[PDB]
Amino acid sequence: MHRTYSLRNSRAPTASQLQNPPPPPSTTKGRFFGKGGLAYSFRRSAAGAFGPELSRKLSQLVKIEKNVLRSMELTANERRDAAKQLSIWGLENDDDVSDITDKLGVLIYEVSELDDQFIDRYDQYRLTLKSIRDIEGSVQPSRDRKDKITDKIAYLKYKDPQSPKIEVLEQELVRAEAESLVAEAQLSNITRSKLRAAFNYQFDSIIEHSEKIALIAGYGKALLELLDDSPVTPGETRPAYDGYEASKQIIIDAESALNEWTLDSAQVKPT
Amino acid sequence: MHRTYSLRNSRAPTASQLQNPPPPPSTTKGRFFGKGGLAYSFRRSAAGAFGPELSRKLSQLVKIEKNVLRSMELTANERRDAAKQLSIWGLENDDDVSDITDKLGVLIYEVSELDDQFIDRYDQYRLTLKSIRDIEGSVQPSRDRKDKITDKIAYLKYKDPQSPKIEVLEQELVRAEAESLVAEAQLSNITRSKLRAAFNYQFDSIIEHSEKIALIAGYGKALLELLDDSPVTPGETRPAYDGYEASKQIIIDAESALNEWTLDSAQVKPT
Ligand SMILES: O=P(O)(O)O[C@@H]1[C@H](O)[C@H](O)[C@@H](OP(=O)(O)O)[C@H](OP(=O)(O)O)[C@H]1O
Ligand SMILES: O=P(O)(O)O[C@@H]1[C@H](O)[C@H](O)[C@@H](OP(=O)(O)O)[C@H](OP(=O)(O)O)[C@H]1O
Numbered sequence: 454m455h456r457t458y459s460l461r462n463s464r465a466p467t468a469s470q471l472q473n474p475p476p477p478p479s480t481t482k483g484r485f486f487g488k489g490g491l492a493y494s495f496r497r498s499a500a501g502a503f504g505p506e507l508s509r510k511l512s513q514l515v516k517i518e519k520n521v522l523r524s525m526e527l528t529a530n531e532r533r534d535a536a537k538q539l540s541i542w543g544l545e546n547d548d549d550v551s552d553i554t555d556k557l558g559v560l561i562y563e564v565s566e567l568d569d570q571f572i573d574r575y576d577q578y579r580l581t582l583k584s585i586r587d588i589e590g591s592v593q594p595s596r597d598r599k600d601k602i603t604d605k606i607a608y609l610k611y612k613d614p615q616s617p618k619i620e621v622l623e624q625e626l627v628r629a630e631a632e633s634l635v636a637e638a639q640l641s642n643i644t645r646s647k648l649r650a651a652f653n654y655q656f657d658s659i660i661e662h663s664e665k666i667a668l669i670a671g672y673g674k675a676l677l678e679l680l681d682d683s684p685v686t687p688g689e690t691r692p693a694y695d696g697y698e699a700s701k702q703i704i705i706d707a708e709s710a711l712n713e714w715t716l717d718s719a720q721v722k723p724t
Numbered sequence: 725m726h727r728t729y730s731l732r733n734s735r736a737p738t739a740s741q742l743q744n745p746p747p748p749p750s751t752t753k754g755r756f757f758g759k760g761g762l763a764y765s766f767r768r769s770a771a772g773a774f775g776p777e778l779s780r781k782l783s784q785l786v787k788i789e790k791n792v793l794r795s796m797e798l799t800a801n802e803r804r805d806a807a808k809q810l811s812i813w814g815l816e817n818d819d820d821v822s823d824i825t826d827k828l829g830v831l832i833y834e835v836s837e838l839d840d841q842f843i844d845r846y847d848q849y850r851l852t853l854k855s856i857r858d859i860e861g862s863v864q865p866s867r868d869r870k871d872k873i874t875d876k877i878a879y880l881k882y883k884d885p886q887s888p889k890i891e892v893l894e895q896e897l898v899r900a901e902a903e904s905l906v907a908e909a910q911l912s913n914i915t916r917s918k919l920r921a922a923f924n925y926q927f928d929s930i931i932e933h934s935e936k937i938a939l940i941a942g943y944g945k946a947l948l949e950l951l952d953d954s955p956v957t958p959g960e961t962r963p964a965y966d967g968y969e970a971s972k973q974i975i976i977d978a979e980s981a982l983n984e985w986t987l988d989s990a991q992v993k994p995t
Contacts, residue, residue, distance in 0.1 A: 454830055454833050454834060454837070455834070455837070455979065455982065455983075465983075467982060467983045467984075467985065468983065468984060468985060468986040468989070469932060469985060469986060469987065472986065472987065475841070475844065476844045476845055476847070476848040477844070478844060479793060479797065479843060479844055479847040480847065480851075481790055481793050481794055481797070481847065482797070487801060488798060488801065488802070489798055510809065510812060510813040511813050513809060514806065514809055514810050514813055517802065517805060517806045517809060518806055519752055520802055521799060521802050521803055521806055522750060522752050523752055524795060524798060524799035524802060525799055526750065526752070526753070527759060527760055527795060528792060528795035528796055528799060530758060530759070531759070531788065531791055531792045531795060532792055534788060535785065535788045535789055535792055538781065538784060538785055538788060539785050541781060542781040542782050542785055545778075546912075546915065547912050547915075547916070549916075550912075550915060550916060550919065553919075554919070557923060559725060562725055563725060563726070566725070566726070570746070572750060573746065573747045573748070573749060573750055574747055576747070576750040576751065576752065577747040577748075580751075634959075635958045635959055638956060638958050638959065638960065639958060641817075641818055641821075641956065641962075642955035642956060644817065644818075644821065645818070645820075645821065645951065645952070645953055645955070646953060646955065648821070648824075648825070648951075649948060649951050649953045652828065652944075652948055653945060653948055656941045656944050656945045656948070657941075657945070659937060659938075659940075659941040660937075660938050660941040660942060660945075661740055663934040663935070663937045663938035663941065664934070664938055664992070666930060666931075666934040667930075667931050667934035667935055667938070667990070667992040668992060668994060669930075670927045670928075670930040670931035670934065670992075671931060671992050671993070671994035672994045673923070673927050674924060674927045674928070674931075675994055677920060677923055677924055677927070680916065680919075680920050681916070682916055682917055682920045684913040684916070684917065685909060685912070685913055687906045687909055687910065688906050688909065689909065691912070706994075706995060707994075708726065710994065710995060711726070711738065712726075712736075712738045712739065713739060714738065714739060714740060715739040715740060715743065716740060716743065718739070719938070720991050720992065720993070721935070721938040721939060721941075721942050721991065722942075722991070723939060723942035723943045723946055723977075723978075723981070724977060724981060
């Protein structure tokens, strides 16, 4: 988060924000529950009511992550349709305009397919989170039994300190305690391992997607440079278009670079 | 698109796809209309029925782009909630685990706010597309009148070649034609200018967002390195955690780098 020490819900402008004023807030921000509907909210609340207490939060996280994946795939499909129909509109235009919008449509198609691949990786990470949820929520009943048996032992001791069940219940409490402390140890180990692996995978997918999208954007801007933005004076003829070969090579190079990209090929250097 | 010349709906694996097998397709791909509901589809169809013919496609593009923006803001809010509640789950864990998941939550919060900024830029680009739609759809009725008047002139000439209305209608046809050819010229000019500017803005926002997300991912992986993934043997104690200062400096550096990022500071070099 970028907030400086102030009560303001506004952050100090960065270098990009200093370069130009930020655009006004989106006009599509309507008034609603802030999420669109209620069925997924009911699912989330059910995850927050019925599940075991100590696993309830992680089950809710898994459900919300599934919602995020659903929304991401839906918006990827919608972006694909938008690119297709944008190029459809650009078909009946100037030949230069038609070619430029067609190539932009292909680039957005690549962006959509890369989004789909990142979505598959994101679902793999979500499955890992589901696995850690499962193991930890199945290790919870050990401590549940420990708490129940210690409460029963306290109640029996208060009611009848000389009851014969005291010794056997004490052995059982010891046994659940040996079952439980070291189970906590194993749970911590597996939680650390699974969390580290899943988040490393997720961040590798994130950086790969970001770098591929950045390369696509750079190639698209270089190809936009090809577009002739010089206006033609009223009443004049249309100059001939000869950018087929240049955009031809540009899209060829974009595909070649996308094939060539590797995890080590990432040029992002954190400091 | 990455498809090689084959009937396969499968693309040759890239270097990243060669490094490891791709994950299986997402398990959340349910059976439905492929989009979730019907109200937005009705809106899109109304955009594809009632509007002027030559502006109908661009109006549909604007509507679909609004749908994309709505979905993007919804998924950004859901990702924000997911990060918050993930860190909420990580609160009651190991102190190292609590700190690492808290910092990851902050990083995903930054990702969400950057998504919101990119969404604002994307809506600015959508507004530019709306503007070009408006001007071009308002220039369409000139050609509509030209076609109507030429049809009327042909019908009148066939019905009565010596009708007195022939000369005045011919002058009006000339006048609409002088109104229309050069209007086509101006429309081509304004379309080129608006499209180039809007797509340059969109691609600049895209590359900025991608680079910021890539820096966030790199810093997050470097911070995940801080996590102690070494398992502890059963029955042993918990080693003391001392990573507060290291993650302290890591998040400080991440914020500093995010402030320092400029458009020229982008390190992506298309070839
Ligand atoms: O004032 P009203 O009667 O409620 O209608 C609004 C506005 O006048 C436009 O018709 C429309 O924007 P466009 O001109 O771009 O179609 C907008 O839709 P929007 O919010 O989805 O943009 C409507 O909400
Ligand atoms: O086959 P169904 O009837 O569609 O139900 C699916 C599955 O059987 C589980 O109930 C659930 O996973 P869990 O066992 O972990 O709850 C999953 O949710 P998910 O995709 O969010 O994991 C559901 O989609």
